[model samples]
Target: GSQEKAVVLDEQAIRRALTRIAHEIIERNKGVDNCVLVGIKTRGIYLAKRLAERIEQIEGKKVPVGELDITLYRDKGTDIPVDITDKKVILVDDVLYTGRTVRAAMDALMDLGRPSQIQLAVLVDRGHRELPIRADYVGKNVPTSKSERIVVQLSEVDGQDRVSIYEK
Candidate 1:
């Protein structure tokens, strides 16, 4: 099948979305106390870093951040270098489509240490859940068909910040 691509969000739109997500996180959590942001490898790490900057700007407090690589959890071993014990953890990701990735991420987190609480935040929430996973904070809620794909390109990885919808 041939693929068609369309831009759903531009650079400014992404910036605004991140700003809003950061604000929502602060408001929902009532503060950043004991809060830590853990990014799933790749683009998620960038999103977490950006949020950390924005959140710190508003709260004047730097939040601890960590990275998790769930590549192995999908098949074999895993290596997640994060200590979330007793801390409020916010799992950051670029997109939330299938619940599998988030599920694997959470499992990896559990292997690390027991967090006081865990929350989810994603840049885009494309509905089509294969599990009971959901994001507490969503920048955009994009409804898509099974064949459609939500491509999130971050500057840290793609040298651009935008969300595109591609169909095959």
Candidate 2:
């Protein structure tokens, strides 16, 4: 086998990172008022949910969470399940890579309604961005090689919370 992997973030680390991000979200926006969390499919949805839970615990307010399936966006269609009009939308994702997904997600969000503002939040920022995208909140910034891959596993989807570096 040519594949090799190493665990970088375990369950506890993930928990702490998300908790920190939740606090940062509240602090940055001065509250969750008029704010919505839109996750970019798959694992991102779970991450968004966790953040919502934490925000509620911290701010005593519920922030609406939504999901965006970027695959449909690639087909020039949208399936976002929220009214984002004039709301401060925070785009959630598991990893930030080449930034194409976030770009497509932005395009998809525009198709729905005009958001007052859009912010990005990611579990990990493995720099190799092909677009001029940056995250407003980052759980971790793992400098990675071009040949390596960052794999984020959420318990809701993968039965565990872990982040790993995979080399091929």
Candidate 3:
């Protein structure tokens, strides 16, 4: 087997990172008021939910959270409503790699409605961007190699919540 795995973040670490991200989000916007979290498909939905929960816990406010599936270059889902008129949509994701998914997600959100502003939040920011996109809130920055892949596993999707580096 030419595969190797290394645990980068445990459950506690993940939780702490999310908490920090939530705080950063609140600080950035001055509050969660006009902010709606739209998480990019798969694990991002769960991460957005967790971020909202943390924000609520810290500010005593419940922010609306939605799921954005950048499937086929569009956000197609019912979990998130179709009214993003002028709300500040913060895109959430597990990992930021090539920035293609994030770019596609922004395009999809734009199709839905004209948001007041769009912000990006990610659990990990592994620098290798093909686009000029950057996250406003970041949990951790793990410098990864070209051949290495960052795997984010959440309990809502996977069996557990953790981040790992896998080499193929």
Candidate 4:
């Protein structure tokens, strides 16, 4: 990871943001009746868990949460493994850079099981896309140049919780 400018969010802010996001999701979907959260492996899954925890606490109900790995669904000149699982999934990730992760996730998801709909979510939305993709739920919309990076460190994954902007 490249070291760059640091943008920090305290536990309070992160919690508030997640709460807001949960409410926004619930308000938009009219509740978690027909919605599911499927987090991509690693950081995304951790974030998904956090989001689900908060949402469940708020809504007083259990929300479906799952983790997905898109290694086999990716086309990076590697062998596409057939060891995919079956589940209703929603592709989750920390960022949408180049849209490759989401694309690979969709591919991997198809091999797993049919999803009702795939909604994208991220902690930050840094601008520098190489594909036609956008997020369904965004925490912060940060605009950046092509040579910049967005670093999101969550306690569940990175042992710390904060977001940063980096340039190399």
TM-score of each: 0.91, 0.92, 0.91, 0.81
lDDT of 4 by residue, 89-137 (tens): 3456776667767877776666565656677887777766667888888
lDDT of 1 by residue, 1-168 (tens): 145477878899999999999999999889998898988877888999999999999999898888877662222244334467988999998888877988988887787789998999999988888899899999999888877888888888898888988887
lDDT of 2 by residue, 1-168 (tens): 135477888999999999999999999899889999998888888899999999999989989888887652211444455689999999999899889899999988887899999999999998988889999999999888988888888888888889998788
* Candidate 4 to truth, TM: 0.81
Model 3: per-residue Cα lDDT over 59-135, one tens digit each:
99988888876662211553665367788999999898888888988888888789999999999988888889999
- Model 4: how far residue 156 lies from native, Å: 1.9
As a whole number from 0 to 100, the lDDT of residue 92 in candidate 2 is: 96
Q: What C-alpha lDDT, on a 0 to 100 scale, does residue 165 get in candidate 1? A: 85
Number of backbone clashes in candidate 4:
0
Looking at model 4, which ten-residue stretch has the lowest summed lDDT? 72-81
lDDT of each: 0.85, 0.87, 0.85, 0.69
Candidate 2: list runs displaced more than 4 Å: 72-82
Looking at candidate 3, what is the lDDT of residue 126? 80
User: Could you say which candidate leads in lDDT?
Assistant: 2
Please give the range of 10 consecutive residues that has the lowest summed lDDT in model 2: 71-80
Better of 2 and 3 by TM-score: 2
Where does candidate 4 stray beyond 4 Å? 8-10, 71-89
